Amino acid sequence: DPRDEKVANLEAQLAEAQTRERDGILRVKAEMENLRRRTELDIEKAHKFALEKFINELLPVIDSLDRALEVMSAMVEDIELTLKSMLDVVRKFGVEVIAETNVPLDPNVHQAIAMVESDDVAPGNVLGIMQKGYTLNGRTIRAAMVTVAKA
Amino acid sequence: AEQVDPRDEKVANLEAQLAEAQTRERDGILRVKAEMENLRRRTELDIEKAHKFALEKFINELLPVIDSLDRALEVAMSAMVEDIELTLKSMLDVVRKFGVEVIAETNVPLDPNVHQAIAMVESDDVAPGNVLGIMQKGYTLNGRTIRAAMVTVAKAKA
Amino acid sequence: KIIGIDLGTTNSCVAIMDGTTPRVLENAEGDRTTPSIIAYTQDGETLVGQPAKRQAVTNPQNTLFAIKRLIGRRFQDEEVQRDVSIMPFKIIAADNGDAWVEVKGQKMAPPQISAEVLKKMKKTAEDYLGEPVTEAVITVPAYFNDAQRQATKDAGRIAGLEVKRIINEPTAAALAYGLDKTGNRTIAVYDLGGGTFDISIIEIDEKTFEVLATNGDTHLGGEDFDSRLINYLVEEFKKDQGIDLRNDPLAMQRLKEAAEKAKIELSSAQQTDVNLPYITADATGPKHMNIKVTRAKLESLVEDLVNRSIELLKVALQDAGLSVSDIDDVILVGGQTRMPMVQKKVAEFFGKEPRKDVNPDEAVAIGAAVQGGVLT
Numbered sequence: 064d065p066r067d068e069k070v071a072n073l074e075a076q077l078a079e080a081q082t083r084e085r086d087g088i089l090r091v092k093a094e095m096e097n098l099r100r101r102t103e104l105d106i107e108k109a110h111k112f113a114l115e116k117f118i119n120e121l122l123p124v125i126d127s128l129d130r131a132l133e134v135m136s137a138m139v140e141d142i143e144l145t146l147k148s149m150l151d152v153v154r155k156f157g158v159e160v161i162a163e164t165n166v167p168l169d170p171n172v173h174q175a176i177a178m179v180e181s182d183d184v185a186p187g188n189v190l191g192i193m194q195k196g197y198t199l200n201g202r203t204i205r206a207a208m209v210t211v212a213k214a
Numbered sequence: 215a216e217q218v219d220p221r222d223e224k225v226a227n228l229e230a231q232l233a234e235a236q237t238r239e240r241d242g243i244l245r246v247k248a249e250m251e252n253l254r255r256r257t258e259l260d261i262e263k264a265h266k267f268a269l270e271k272f273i274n275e276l277l278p279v280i281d282s283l284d285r286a287l288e289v290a291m292s293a294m295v296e297d298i299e300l301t302l303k304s305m306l307d308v309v310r311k312f313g314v315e316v317i318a319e320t321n322v323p324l325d326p327n328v329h330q331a332i333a334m335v336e337s338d339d340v341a342p343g344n345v346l347g348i349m350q351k352g353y354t355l356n357g358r359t360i361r362a363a364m365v366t367v368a369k370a371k372a
Numbered sequence: 373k374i375i376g377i378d379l380g381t382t383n384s385c386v387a388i389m390d391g392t393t394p395r396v397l398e399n400a401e402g403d404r405t406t407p408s409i410i411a412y413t414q415d416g417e418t419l420v421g422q423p424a425k426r427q428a429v430t431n432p433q434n435t436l437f438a439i440k441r442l443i444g445r446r447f448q449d450e451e452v453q454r455d456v457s458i459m460p461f462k463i464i465a466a467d468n469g470d471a472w473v474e475v476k477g478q479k480m481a482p483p484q485i486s487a488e489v490l491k492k493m494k495k496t497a498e499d500y501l502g503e504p505v506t507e508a509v510i511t512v513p514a515y516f517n518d519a520q521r522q523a524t525k526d527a528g529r530i531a532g533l534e535v536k537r538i539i540n541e542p543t544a545a546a547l548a549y550g551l552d553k554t555g556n557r558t559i560a561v562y563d564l565g566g567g568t569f570d571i572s573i574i575e576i577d578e579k580t581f582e583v584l585a586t587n588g589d590t591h592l593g594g595e596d597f598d599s600r601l602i603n604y605l606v607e608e609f610k611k612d613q614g615i616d617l618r619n620d621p622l623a624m625q626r627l628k629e630a631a632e633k634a635k636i637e638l639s640s641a642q643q644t645d646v647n648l649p650y651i652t653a654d655a656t657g658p659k660h661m662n663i664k665v666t667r668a669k670l671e672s673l674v675e676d677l678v679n680r681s682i683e684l685l686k687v688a689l690q691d692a693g694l695s696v697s698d699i700d701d702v703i704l705v706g707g708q709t710r711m712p713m714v715q716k717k718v719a720e721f722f723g724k725e726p727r728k729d730v731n732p733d734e735a736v737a738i739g740a741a742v743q744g745g746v747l748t
Binding site: 066069070073074076077080081083084087088091092094095098099102105106109110113114117120121123124127128130131134135138139141142144145148149152155156 | 289312
């Protein structure tokens with residue numbers, strides 16, 4: 064009994080430290096995986112965010128190319144190529160443009176700034192783009208200022 | 215301390231295993247502790263990195279757009295030019311907002327960290343070895359070079 | 373940790389297994405691939421990689437490159453002597469009678485040079501893991517005589533790297549894809565590099581590895597596919613404008629890169645534009661270059677070089693007495709294999725499509741990482 068009762072508690076003492084190591088490992092090993100999975104999130108957010116702010120301040124720069132292409136015959140053929148690639152490059156990041164005319168007004172995409180008599184499009188349909196609109200992946204990021212056609 | 219009784223060397227054995235067990239555990243728990251300490255050092259880096267160079271791929275795909283723009287000023291109605299000169303200025307000034315600086319400064323020694331000698335030219339306009347003129351702007355994003363400038367280095371008088 | 377290292381002739385890469393998953397590291401500049409160049413600046417600086425490539429012009433005689441072409445050879449050899457004719461740097465004979473190089477009057481052994489690059493890789497892995505590294509696997513060409521494999525070993529020592537095993541480049545790509553574990557596969561690694569094309573047919577008798585047949589070229593890789601486009605352009609200009617840009621250093625160096633940027637763009641596009649304003653000038657005023665190159669023209673320009681590869685792909689199997697059928701697997705290695713036309717022309721001579729699920733320029737480096745991996 065003096066050693067039987069001791070031989071038992073020894074065995075236990077061993078299962079404890081055994082499983083205690085096993086589990087302890089696991090907790091820190093799944094603990095490390097959350098740290099991982101959680102930093103990806105945190106990097107992929109601050110990125111989606113920087114990508115949006117950038118794409119943003121860049122819009123006026125495209126507008127510049129427009130205002131300019133809109134005020135020589137081979138020079139322009141250039142500004143039109145610069146422009147196409149500006150846009151081509153951007154598409155790559157989800158930025159598309161709103162400037163399809165003859166579409167019913169849609170406050171989600173358009174911002175009418177003036178109405179005008181015309182027969183060029185049934186009334187109510189956007190006509191004339193005072194400024195092109197943009198959207199990344201659809202979420203309208205800047206509404207195309209437009210001129211709705213009034214009969 | 216006699217221990218010929220097998221039952222005594224049995225208790226003496228269990229006593230040893232457990233001592234081993236305790237050993238493994240202690241250390242086996244220290245390496246998996248240190249092991250993550252290392253993963254925390256990285257996550258921080260990976261983060262501070264993706265912060266500095268998030269836009270690098272984008273702001274790298276626009277270089278050829280800054281290029282056709284000034285290229286269009288090179289081959290170069292007075293307004294259209296001041297117009298496309300102002301654009302190129304907002305563009306540059308904007309990417310500069312996001313940590314980009316433009317490598318385009320002459321009379322400085324050639325620095326292969328952000329310079330690409332594209333040719334030696336016999337000139338006294340500047341000290342031998344310095345960039346003599348730039349063929350094409352070079353851009354850097356937060357420290358790392360995204361495109362070295364293509365410079366023209368200078369060689370002695372004749 | 374046994375950081376795996378691919379000590380290329382034109383570029384080198386370094387990897388380490390993140391657990392069981394291969395993780396190709398990236399240098400200080402943010403490149404996963406570091407050119408194998410090393411220059412000793414006039415002022416005594418020892419540049420390596422990108423920076424060293426960037427000051428080559430201004431410093432041809434002290435910007436060493438393609439040192440792998442000399443690593444384990446004697447001052448005499450078809451290779452060595454015939455290099456002495458093109459290498460802008462001084463290749464002298466060593467007292468031992470080995471092929472060496474002289475930079476600014478000082479004479480150094482080929483290995484002493486490569487070590488500079490290994491040095492940079494070791495520092496690159498160290499910069500990642502945090503802890504110093506001291507162990508690695510370095511890859512060599514399946515035809516490397518004991519002399520080179522060893523001299524390739526001396527390089528590591530000089531760099532603080534205990535070469536825990538220098539395995540084959542072909543084997544490297546095989547281990548890189550997953551040809552280790554049904555029970556017997558026959559692989560053929562198509563290796564088109566920056567300057568060299570080497571083909572290897574190896575047998576992984578299941579898990580053994582065995583070079584069954586090896587053949588390749590010493591003068592045949594991208595850099596040669598490049599000179600095709602460059603020239604096309606020089607000739608085209610002459611036809612459309614009566615000028616020889618060759619005569620011109622500034623214009624040539626300029627056209628070279630454009631051609632290079634063109635050649636790469638023409639593999640994800642159908643045509644691109646070599647646009648070089650103020651390319652030159654003459655009695656009739658300034659000249660501008662604007663050409664259109666199509667996947668097709670380029671291809672037409674690089675044909676006999678892609679076919680020259682295959683004709684060698686033919687004698688590689690004739691010596692290994694097998695048909696494209698006996699070949700159970702064919703892998704590609706060499707950024708230049710990214711060109712559709714080679715991908716194809718090869719997919720046709722072997723029937724089955726070559727596999728490239730793994731980066732053509734990181735492959736062999738990754739192979740080398742997995743070997744020294746949990747294995748060594």
